[PDB]
Amino acid sequence: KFTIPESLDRIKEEFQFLQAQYHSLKLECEKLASEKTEMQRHYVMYYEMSYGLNIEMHKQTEIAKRLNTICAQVIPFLSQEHQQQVAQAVERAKQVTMAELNAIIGQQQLQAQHLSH
Amino acid sequence: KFTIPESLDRIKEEFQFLQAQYHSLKLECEKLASEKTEMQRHYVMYYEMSYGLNIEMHKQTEIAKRLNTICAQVIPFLSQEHQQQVAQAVERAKQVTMAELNAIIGQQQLQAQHLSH
Amino acid sequence: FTIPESLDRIKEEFQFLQAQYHSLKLECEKLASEKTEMQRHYVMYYEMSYGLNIEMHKQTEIAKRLNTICAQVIPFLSQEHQQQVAQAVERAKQVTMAELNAIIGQQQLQAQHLHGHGPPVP
Amino acid sequence: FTIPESLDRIKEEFQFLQAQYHSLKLECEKLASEKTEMQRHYVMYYEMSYGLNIEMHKQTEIAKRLNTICAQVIPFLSQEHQQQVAQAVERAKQVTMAELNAIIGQQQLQAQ
């Protein structure tokens, strides 16, 4: 008639179960925290990087314009035999293929490698 | 004497305490997951950004180079006063101050903000 | 079959068992007391029975002896005297239930000191 | 963080309590049987006491009467005869331990 030891052992079971589920969730949490933090460090890294890159990019863009404007302003004082040539020159100058890009990048990277001494 | 009930009720207390801890911790966990997800999003964003900005930076640098060479070649085939004029003009065109830059990036992001209504 | 109400159930059953043990305990004690009382009365009435046994067998023997003596002394008498005495003795060996109740009830009323041996049987 | 300990402790105390209840119950029941057996005996010796009392007083009375009529008959005898009968009656009312002992175990020593 006395359902005590079975009930108490049942309790031992489900307490231990709850405890286990807790600890599981806690480990999961700790992982989430770590991975989130590393993710954040990456985020900051490329944030700052994109920042500096942005600044230098705008810089070179403005320099490029200014040089072009200068060209557009020396052309009228230039002779019609020289005008056409330098016009075409500036035309193509504005065109940069992925091959050229890859070439100057690869070269200057190689330079950084060879200067890393 | 046997102090059962007194202890029995105690284990109930510790139990409800445990389940409470599980609940609150779970809420914290879900929040943390959302946060990490958002962090990852911005990581990949600033990454792709950094990439594009790198490529574009090298592009603009190359264009500026080419155009500067164009000027440095055209200028000696001009006038004496105009030769000096253009020389100084170019060597000043290379000069980009941080104030000017702040202005450029400003107007860029402001007009980006406005053109995208 | 919840978790908290489970613990409550545990308590309930335990308190129940505590109560049960208490009741059983006091019942066991009153029980033992009753036992010792019964034992006392037992020894008492056994011993009393031994006494009554001895006395009964004694008076029985004395009576038998005296009857024999009368039996032997009778044939010495006159014919009428013999009849009278024989009648007298065989009438003497007759006690009814009324007079037996009388002597018993009396000797009872005489044996008072403030014992037992009462005429009913409860 | 100290819950399984508690539970096993509860189990221990409960098992203790019920073991004690079992033992106390068994002892109680054996004691009950003993009490009842005794009661049987006390009843037995009660009714025995009753009967023994009745027969004791009956035989006592009979003895008294017979003695009285011996006393009645005696004075009508010759002197020597009177002395003999008086001595015999006198002796009769004297029962010794060996006599009554040998008498108590009569029914038993009277078989076949």
Swiss-Prot record, chains A, B:
It comes from the Eukaryota. Residues 1-113 are annotated as: Q domain. In all tissues examined, mostly in brain, liver and muscle. It is found in: Nucleus. Phosphorylated, probably by CDK1. The degree of phosphorylation varies throughout the cell cycle, and is highest at the G2/M transition. Becomes hyperphosphorylated in response to cell differentiation and interaction with HES1 or RUNX1. Ubiquitinated by XIAP/BIRC4. WD repeat Groucho/TLE family members are characterized by 5 regions, a glutamine-rich Q domain, a glycine/proline-rich GP domain, a central CcN domain, containing a nuclear localization signal, and a serine/proline-rich SP domain. The most highly conserved are the N-terminal Q domain and the C-terminal WD-repeat domain. Transcriptional corepressor that binds to a number of transcription factors. Inhibits NF-kappa-B-regulated gene expression. Inhibits the transcriptional activation mediated by FOXA2, and by CTNNB1 and TCF family members in Wnt signaling. Enhances FOXG1/BF-1- and HES1-mediated transcriptional repression. The effects of full-length TLE family members may be modulated by association with dominant-negative AES. Unusual function as coactivator for ESRRG. Homooligomer and heterooligomer with other family members. Binds RUNX1, RUNX3, FOXA2, KDM6A, UTY, histone H3, HESX1, ESRRG and the NF-kappa-B subunit RELA. Interacts with HES1 (via WRPW motif). Binds TCF7, LEF1, TCF7L1 and TCF7L2. Interacts with SIX3. Interacts with EFNB1. Interacts with TLE4. Interacts with FOXG1/BF-1; the interaction is inhibited by TLE6/GRG6. Belongs to the WD repeat Groucho/TLE family. This is Transducin-like enhancer protein 1.
